[PDB]
């Protein structure tokens, strides 16, 4: 989708054409007198940048603005000026660094901007960067967007192409990420990916406790992830179409390997998961048998089914583009008032 990727209106619309050295000196003065500064200066700097050392200056001054008296403004149009300035001058190391230490820089791209970024990642054909970035979007907790299909494709491809037996952090990341894309309640792909994510989260809990499940990850504390997966399977069997894949075999593997032979957050009355494993496994066998008695092809490769999604993907990209032009228009509308606002200071002077 080269048309969906490229957009030269952004780079040919409202350029400031000021001196980078002068802007840098002014920002240094303002930040050594540690007085607050508007986002107009940083935006003018960004959209004037045309060089590598200049983008590095922008990174440093963005860190300094995060650590400046004002941090909440977080203008998405400025964020995308920076993103374009970085990706057109192809600094993927810097982009990834900022995106991972968002707490250090505080970049927060929106739906279409992030979809452009990930499409550029596709074009360059890299997987590790995209994987780390989709984990950071799992951190973002922003998925009700047209980029939901891109996230789904990415995760469905990378969970298969992973080839990594044991990694607790990575596996928890995958488990917690596989939920959000499927929350749009679409089809078998959606709710069975939700199921597999429930399974992964229950596995991570049972293998390293419930602490990491929520400590540095936004999740719910109900330990019955296996119970929730069983509930999902039973309600699906009760209810449409259920295109299935052999990840139920991975679920069986996890269940059997857990059935195989300090602070206590669990409640006394409530049974412990270690003691619930038996009925978990028996009910899991029961639901397995019920599903096979009831869809059960388990051959349709899930990453290949995302190619069927490309049609409605190419349909929703139109609405995404439309919303992006609306954002551009309202940006150009509300931003011009801020320039007269800067002129008001000199008018009063």
């Amino acid at each position: 989708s080269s048309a969906y990727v490229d957009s030269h209106k952004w780079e040919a619309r409202e350029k400031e054409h000021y001196c980078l050295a002068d802007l840098a000196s002014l920002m240094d003065k303002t930040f050594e007198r540690k007085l607050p500064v508007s986002s107009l200066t940083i935006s003018r700097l960004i959209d004037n940048i045309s060089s590598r050392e200049e983008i590095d200056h922008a990174e440093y001054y963005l860190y300094k603005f995060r650590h400046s008296p004002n941090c909440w403004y977080l203008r998405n149009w400025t964020i995308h000026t920076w993103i374009r300035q970085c990706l057109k001058y192809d600094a993927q190391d810097k982009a990834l660094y900022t995106l991972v230490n968002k707490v250090q820089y505080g970049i927060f791209p929106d739906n279409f901007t992030f979809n452009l970024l990930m499409d550029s990642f596709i074009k360059k054909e890299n997987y590790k960067d995209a994987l780390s970035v989709v984990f950071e979007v799992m951190m973002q907790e922003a998925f009700e967007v047209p980029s939901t299909q891109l996230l789904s494709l990415y995760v469905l491809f990378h969970c298969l192409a992973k080839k990594t037996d044991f990694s607790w952090e990575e596996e928890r990341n995958f488990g917690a990420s596989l939920l959000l894309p499927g929350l749009k309640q679409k089809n078998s792909v959606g709710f069975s990916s939700q199921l597999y994510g429930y399974a992964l989260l229950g596995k991570v809990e049972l293998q390293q406790g419930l602490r990491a499940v929520y400590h540095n990850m936004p999740l719910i504390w109900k330990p019955g992830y296996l119970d929730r997966a069983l509930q999902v399977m039973e309600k699906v069997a009760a209810s449409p179409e259920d295109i299935k894949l052999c990840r139920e075999a991975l679920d069986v593997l996890g269940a059997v390997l857990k059935a195989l032979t300090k602070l206590v957050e669990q409640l006394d009355i409530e049974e412990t998961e270690q003691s619930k494993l038996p009925q978990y496994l028996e009910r899991f066998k029961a639901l397995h048998s019920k599903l096979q008695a009831l869809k059960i092809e388990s051959e349709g490769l899930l990453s290949l089914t995302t190619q069927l999604v490309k049609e409605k993907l190419s349909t929703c990209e139109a609405e995404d583009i439309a919303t992006y032009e609306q954002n551009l228009q309202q940006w150009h509308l509300d931003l011009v008032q801020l320039i007269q606002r800067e002129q008001q200071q000199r008018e009063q002077a």
């Binding site: 995060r66 650590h67 400046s68 008296p69 004002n70 941090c71 909440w72 977080l74 968002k102 707490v103 250090q104 505080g106 927060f108 951190m139 973002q140 907790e141 922003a142 939920l179 959000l180 929350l183 602490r211 929520y214 400590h215 936004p218 999740l219 719910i220 504390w221 602070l263």
Partner: protein
């Protein structure tokens, strides 16, 4: 009568100096997790919160991982949800982090709240922000989580006094005296307070 001026001078100077260079919220809230002692104070932490400070993090450290520190996003009082089965949260409206903080893990923020599904129409100040007892709820599992639906006799001596009084008055009033208790809104300990009322070093 003789006045004195240097006293007022030193008062004004101390006021200006302290309001200028008071210790930063982040600087005085920072904690070393292996010794459990706040810098700038040399004081130890309470045993009830030792483990919570060792394990769990602070509200702004939670909010630094998402855009705009999550306006309207679900944050609940861990203490409230451990002390009561009912849901309680914070409709955070305004936020302001401390620029001096490196990780931007300290600041002031508040909005509307709700106690056991009893919401009031006031965006007031939070209480106990710097504690390590903050739990963020995602955007999923939102509505399922937020879902929510006489009199006493007087003391014996006092009722006897009133009986004697009204018998002397002449009226019978055989009805035993009572008071209203449904009006008395006994509030639990955990109901929040006004941060501004409590001071600061």
């Amino acid at each position: 009568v003789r006045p004195r001026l240097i006293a007022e001078l030193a008062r004004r100077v101390r006021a200006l100096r302290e309001q200028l260079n008071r210790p930063r919220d982040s600087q005085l809230y920072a904690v070393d997790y292996e010794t459990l002692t706040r810098p700038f104070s040399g004081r130890r932490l309470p045993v009830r919160a030792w483990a919570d400070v060792r394990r769990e993090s602070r509200l702004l450290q939670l909010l630094g991982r998402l855009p705009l520190f999550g306006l309207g996003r679900l944050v609940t009082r861990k203490s409230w949800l451990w002390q009561h089965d009912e849901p309680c949260y914070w409709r955070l409206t305004r936020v302001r982090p401390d620029y001096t903080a490196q990780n931007l893990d300290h600041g002031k923020a508040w909005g509307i709240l709700t106690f056991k599904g009893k919401t009031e129409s006031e965006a007031r100040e939070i209480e106990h922000v710097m504690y390590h007892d903050w739990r963020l709820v995602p955007k999923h599992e939102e509505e399922a989580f937020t879902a929510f639906t006489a009199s006493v006799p007087y003391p014996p001596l006092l009722r006897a006094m009133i009986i004697a009084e009204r018998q002397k008055n002449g009226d019978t009033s055989t009805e035993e005296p009572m008071l209203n208790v449904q009006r008395i809104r006994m509030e639990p300990w955990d109901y929040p307070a006004k941060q501004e009322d409590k001071g600061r070093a």
